[PDB]
Homo-oligomer: 203 residues x 5
């Protein structure tokens, strides 16, 4: 990272990243992990981080394709030297040039732009690995209400609905997709009931 | 943490937190762990920590609801700019504003207030996820006395009884709810016998 | 720890401690782990460390009983303010007072005395959880000699025999309690044979 | 490492390296791990790192043989003292001489030369441990398309084909070697279809 | 360690050591790890490190016996104060004295001598726990050639043969002890074939 002088990336960050990816794959919570681990990262460090993933090479090739396409679109829209597309990807620029950019006046936040492209690609990948849609989640005859609610809320988070859409899904789908007994309990609770009241009544 | 200058959050804290939650769920001892891991944390850091949990998304939504309700009640009671409820929760304030606040004279301890709200929500959730009451724990015909005592004391800790109530429960319930052989042994020991003496006599 | 200024306790120490207790219970080697992890700890830190154990709440109550009894005996024998019994246990003293005491001239090593009380309680508890005595360990008809010797020496360490007693036990008991074939081999080796020679002859 | 003064190598790097090798063997992503962990390493540190691997002793001896061959060829092409072949391997030079070299003006990048030889040997070994060729990868009757594609791309990365060859393999082989249903779907998609479109159509 | 002032040993080193011993027992690669973790260690630190091992108490008693034997022989051969035998083992000297010796002029590297004795004892124990000799490794009818070669070379590394003897063993024994198909392949390859060529031909 940069903190102003350059500091070597620690092995701990690499090990944490590889372990999170091995254990959690592309579950939605991996993205805030990337965001925390990439604080202050240069493009070289980010490329190192990307290369450190051992599995899922299809996803990583997709990521390379998306980042290079976004860099080409940047070069089409936005023609010490000025950084070009191949400069943002860290493949034709040296560390010293990146350090110079990070400490120039005014600063050119090339790291933040690369991180934004990377988070866009990860969002695409997480969207791709979405197991099932929200409408396909229905409570089993003996499925625990808490476990079913947790799975439903996880699926809703996995989707890309807007806040108004997410709120409407939370309201309508949860009551509509519940098992008949829990649906009757919620209906007896009445509209406007908070999540805690419904959960404590169902149990 | 803050130590005064800002320091980057370490990967170790995130990994420890995720591992404790995966391995222990909401057992009571997770809260002092949270308290230790959040030493000097800004609210942004707390939101990062919260978002990194991958499962139990019902619980995390419950926590968000409780924190936002407490921030609204604070704003109702307590109407550099002055922080509003959503400012205390770190959703509309930047890191730089938080660093400025942490080093202001007099300091405005937004981190301690946010931590208090979070610990209130965790206490509520642990109390809600309490498996069974104290009165339902009875010793089996061949259950080991040490294991039964450990389970009883764990259940008592899980409850929210006051110190006088907890002491009365420890005295009356333990002797009354024990299996007949251990109850007879304790009665033969006599009143005022310490816990260590009773345990070493039962074994 | 204190190193002189106060430094926040690291998550690594908490995670190591909880894991050692989970993996090793009260095997004798857990005590040197406590001694290493509690270097420079304040009483607040010790209470934090104790509270982080999730299981074995019987053991922790026994520890609380022993520490409070020893603090009462200390107050009976030993009636900036002077610390009382409840001050060493960190329940009625603040962090700032502990820092002041730790950096006074002359220093009052309240942490080392508290550590001594804690180690006394751990020695008492480990002795209590001793599975079996030394005399009940006899080699099986087909039990490997190395595994049996390792188990025997572990049991001997678990006991509280003096150095002269331990040495006599190592000499007499090992040869006497061994299976007949290994006993004959050791007798053929002759007195004064070192442990390595006996082990390499038996194998 | 050197950062300029010498710093002791941390235990974390050694533990990370041994664990990565234990868990991933010589999968291709292990090479970027070596590259990140060996930042600033002296030859002594690199020899320690290599020797700490416990299994796969055939591969590590092969690496020693290969490195000594490059050192002999270097001595053939390139006959404060000057470093000789056995000096590049760190077997006949002291710490003081290597530190002196690392800080000479002009610098003699003995670490970079040793690292290049090591990465060449690891690349040779990974090529040797290549399980199967690309042409032997065929989709099963019920094999998931995503898993098959991931395995195919992993195998392709494991190979040493040039960029033009790799691109032609990705285009022709993937469509030709797929199962009939996915092949028909891809043909219906038409030429020029991106990886994301093909993957989202197949699923 | 000493780096010159004394620094407290970190919990990370202890945890790494206990984990390596738990996971690898006395496999040969544990020794260079010990050597790296004990950089700059005083004898007090070495005794602490040793005591943190929870299992394998037979081996540790053997190690104590061996170290005391070298200290007695040293005292027989080698009769600010001068360090005696019991002083090198850290049982009768204080920390202040050890720091004083480590910084004396000329320095007396009593720590290096203790480390040499410790590595001698570990080498003796690893040799003793050597499972089988080199001559007993024969390829199975369907055993993979790579796995068999790795196991054979690991066994060879476990031995203490000289370089000329080890090299002759690697050449003659590997080809002679191989399964008939691989032996025929190697014979068809001809003398002077390198290990990589033979391995890539066999596969």
């Amino acid at each position: 990272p940069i903190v102003m002088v350059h500091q070597a990336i620690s092995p701990l960050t690499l090990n944490a990243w590889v372990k999170v990816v091995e254990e959690k794959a592309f579950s939605p919570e991996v993205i805030p992990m990337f965001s925390a681990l990439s604080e202050g990262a240069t493009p070289q460090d980010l490329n190192t981080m990307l290369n450190t993933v051992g599995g899922h090479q299809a996803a990583m090739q997709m990521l390379k394709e998306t980042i290079n396409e976004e860099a080409a679109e940047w070069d089409r829209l936005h023609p010490m030297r000025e950084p070009r597309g191949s400069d943002i990807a860290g493949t034709t620029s040296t560390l010293q040039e990146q350090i110079g950019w990070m400490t120039h006046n005014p600063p050119i936040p090339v790291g933040e732009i690369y991180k934004r492209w990377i988070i866009l690609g990860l969002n695409k990948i997480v969207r791709m690995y979405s197991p099932t849609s929200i409408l396909d989640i229905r409570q089993g005859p003996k499925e625990p209400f808490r476990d079913y609610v947790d799975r439903f809320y996880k699926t809703l988070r996995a989707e890309q609905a807007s806040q108004e859409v997410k709120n409407w899904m939370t309201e309508t789908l949860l009551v509509q997709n519940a098992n008949p007994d829990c649906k009757t309990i919620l209906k007896a609770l009445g509209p406007g009931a908070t999540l805690e009241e419904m959960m404590t009544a169902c149990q």
